[PDB]
Write a protein that binds this ligand. Sequence first.
Ligand SMILES: *[C@@H]1O[C@H](CO)[C@@H](O[C@@H]2O[C@H](CO)[C@@H](O)[C@H](O)[C@H]2NC(C)=O)[C@H](O)[C@H]1NC(C)=O
Ligand SMILES: *[C@@H]1O[C@H](CO)[C@@H](O[C@@H]2O[C@H](CO)[C@@H](O)[C@H](O)[C@H]2NC(C)=O)[C@H](O)[C@H]1NC(C)=O
Lengths: 98, 44, 93
Amino acid sequence: QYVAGYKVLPPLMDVNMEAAYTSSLLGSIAGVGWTAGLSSFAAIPFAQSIFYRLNGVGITQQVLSENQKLIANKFNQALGAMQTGFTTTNEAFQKVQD
Amino acid sequence: FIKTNNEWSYTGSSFYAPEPITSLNTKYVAPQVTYQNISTNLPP
Amino acid sequence: IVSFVVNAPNGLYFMHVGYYPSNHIEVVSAYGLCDAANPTNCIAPVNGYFIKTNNEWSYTGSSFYAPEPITSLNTKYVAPQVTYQNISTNLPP
Ligand SMILES: *[C@@H]1O[C@H](CO)[C@@H](O[C@@H]2O[C@H](CO)[C@@H](O)[C@H](O)[C@H]2NC(C)=O)[C@H](O)[C@H]1NC(C)=O
Ligand SMILES: *[C@@H]1O[C@H](CO)[C@@H](O[C@@H]2O[C@H](CO)[C@@H](O)[C@H](O)[C@H]2NC(C)=O)[C@H](O)[C@H]1NC(C)=O
C-alpha cells in the first residue's frame, strides 16, 4: 500500500455499528410486519409470527394449527441446508468473490 | 370451492386440504350465469 | 400521507408530508377475544389491537393510542385458535 503509496480508508462505521443494526433489524423483523403502518410495534413471539405470515399467503389455519412440528422441522432443515452450501454453486458467494 | 370424494368443501390456495365451508371463508356476491346451481344440500 | 410536486431550475422538487409518531408507551394486548361458552364465536380486530386498559377489553388503532369499546365496525369473525385469549365475564355485543 505504501510501495507505490496510496491510502485505504476504513469504512464510515465500525463493525459493532453493523452488528447493532443487524441485531436491531433481526429483533424487529418479527414485530414490524403484523399491521400496515410503522407507528405501532408488534414484537410477537416468532412462532405466531410465522403462523400468521404463512396463513396470509393462502393457507387455512387448520393445517398449521395441527402440523406445527413438521413445518418446524422443515424450517430447521431448510435453514441448516445452507450452512454447508457456501461453495462455487452459490451465486451470491460468487458475486462476493467477484 | 373444492369437490369432494370422501357435496362441496373448502380448500385454500396453497395447500390441498378439503374442509367444510362456513361463513368464515366466503362472501355474498351477486349471481352470474356461470355459477353452479344446487338445491339438495344447502351450505350453512 | 401526502406529497406535492414543484419545478426546480434543473429538475423536480418534492414535498412529502408524513406521519411522525412520538411519546410511545407500552400496554398489554391480546390476539383474539372469544367466548368460553361458545368456542366457535371468536372475533379479531381490524387495523388495530384488542386492548386491556384502565380508566374487560376495548379497541385501539394502529398509529395512536385512542381507547374505544369494540363493535362490529372494527372487527371480523375469524376461526378459533387455541392461543386466543378467552373471556367469560363481560361479553361485548
Ligand atoms: C342456475 O339457474 C339460473 C336460473 O335460470 C341460471 O341463470 C340464468 O340463466 C339464463 C340461461 O342462459 C341466463 O339467460 C340468465 O342471464 C341467467 N341469470 C342469472 C342471474 O345468472 C344459471 O345460469 C344457472 N346456473 C347453472 C346452470 O350453472
Ligand atoms: C380457551 O378455551 C378453549 C376451550 O376450553 C381452549 O382450547 C382448548 O385448550 C386445550 C388446553 O389448552 C387444548 O388441549 C385444546 O386443543 C384447545 N381446543 C382447541 C380447539 O384448540 C383454549 O386453550 C382456551 N384459551 C385460553 C387462553 O384459556
